[PDB]
Design a protein around this nucleic acid. Sequence first.
RNA 1: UACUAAGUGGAAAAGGAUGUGAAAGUGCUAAAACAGCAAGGAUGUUGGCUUAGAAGCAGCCAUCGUUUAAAGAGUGCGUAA
Lengths: 137, 37, 134, 128
Amino acid sequence: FLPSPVDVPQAKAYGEDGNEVLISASDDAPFVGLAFKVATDPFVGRLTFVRVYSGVLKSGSYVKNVRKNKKERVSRLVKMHAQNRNEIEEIRAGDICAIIGLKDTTTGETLVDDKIDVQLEAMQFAQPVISLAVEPK
Amino acid sequence: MKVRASVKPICKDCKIIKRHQIVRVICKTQKHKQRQG
Amino acid sequence: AGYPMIDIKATLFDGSFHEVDSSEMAFKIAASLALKEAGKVCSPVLLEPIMAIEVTVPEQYFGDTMGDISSRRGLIEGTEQRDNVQVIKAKVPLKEMFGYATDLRSFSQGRGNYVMQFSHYAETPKSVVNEIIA
Amino acid sequence: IAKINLLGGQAKPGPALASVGINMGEFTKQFNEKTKDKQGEMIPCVITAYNDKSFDFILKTTPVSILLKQAAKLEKGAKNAKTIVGKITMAKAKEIAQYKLVDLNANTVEAALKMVLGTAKQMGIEVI
RNA sequence: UACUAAGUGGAAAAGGAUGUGAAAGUGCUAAAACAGCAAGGAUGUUGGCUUAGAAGCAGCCAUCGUUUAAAGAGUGCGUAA
C-alpha cells in the first residue's frame, strides 16, 4: 500500500528565494538536494543526511547551494546505513544520501546541479515554546 | 487507627466501639480513627 | 539592576544665574546627577507580561485545567466550545507560566495542551516588584 | 442542566448554554430577540429538556438586588445594610414589584414590596 | 432481693468512656406522632465584594420576602458560577 515516489502525493515546497509555488517531487531529470539532518565528527568531517527528491547529485566538483547562492568545493560523499558508512557519490530520487564534510549546510537548503527551482522550506516547522533561562558563566 | 489513651468524638461519626476487646472509634473520617481509648 | 527605564517622563525645574563664569557643562553634570539621584530615590515599580491564555484543552481535562488555572488565579469568565476541545479565555502570570505546560501535562497526561498569546506589559504585582527593588 | 445569570445581548461565555445538547448560535439568534426586551442588569436563564435541549426556554425575572443597586445608582454598596445612598423611584419600585409578583411564590403586591426591601438591606437602601 | 458479665473479685493513676440494670425532673403519640422511608423538602438569588460567573454554598454577611407541611441565600453535597 505504500507506493513509488511518483504514485505518492508529493509534498509541496515553497522555496524562500521567490518561487513559493506548488511543485511536485516526481522522479525526473532536474535534481534537488535537501539536507534534512546533520551530525558532527571532527576526524572525517561533518556527516550531513540529505534527501534526494529529484535527479542525480553530482560530486567531485563545485556543488551549488542556492540558499547560500554559491558553489562549494566538496571532497567525498557518503551514506550512513543502519550499520555502516559507505563512501558513495550518488543516490537517486526517492532515497536518502549524505555528505561527509560540507561544514556549511542547513535544514531546507537546496543543492543543485541542473539548476532546478528553489525549495527552501522553513514554514512547515514550528517553535519550541515555553522558556527556561540560562545564566552566563 | 492509632493507639491513644482517651477517645474524643472529634467527628460526628466517631462511634466508640470495642473490637476484639480493643476500644476504638469507627467513623467515616479515617483521619480521626484511633485506638485504646 | 540595569533594567530598562522606559515609559517615564523627565521634568526640568530650575537653574542658577551668575556673571563671573559658572559656565555650561558644570550645569550639564549637575543636571545629570540630579536626574540620576531622582531615579535613585524614586522607589520604582516594574512591568512584566501577564498573558491572556487561550486554553485549548480536550473535554476530558477541561475541569482539571479549570481547577489548575483557578489555583493559578486566572480570570475565567467563561469557556467557548469547539469540536472536541473547550477553549478557556483566562489569564496567567509569567511566573506561574514557567512549567505551566509541563505541570498541566503532568496533571493531564499531556493531552491538555496550551495556546499562549503575547500580551501587553503590565505592572508587576506587589510581591514580584518588591523582590527587585534595591 | 444549569441555570445561568446570563446577559441581555450576547450569551457566548459560559460552558453551560454552549453545550448541554444544543448548538450555541442557533439558540443565540433567539436569545437576541427573546431577551432584547429583557436587557439591563444580568437576567436569569434556565435550560431544560425538550428532547435534550432545543426549545422551551423562558427567562426568570432579574435578580433585583444588583438591579436594586442600580436603582440606587450603585454597583457595590456593602455586605450589610448601611447609610442611605440611593432610592428606587415610584415607577421603578412599582415595575419591580409587578416584575417579581410572578417570579415569587407570593400573591400580592405588598409581598413584592416586602421582597424588594428584604434584599434591600444587603446594600443599604430603603424600598419605598 | 438490686446488679454484674469485667472474674469486676483476684491490682491500680491524670485523663478519657453514645459503660450494664434501676431510678428522679422534662413530651408527644394511643386517634397512631417521633425513627427510616413513599416521599414534598421550595422559592429573589449567580444578591453583591473579593474571588473569573465563588454570586443558596473557596469566604463574608443584610439571610429578609414569600407558598405553605416544611424550609435554610440552605444539613450540606455538587459545583466554573
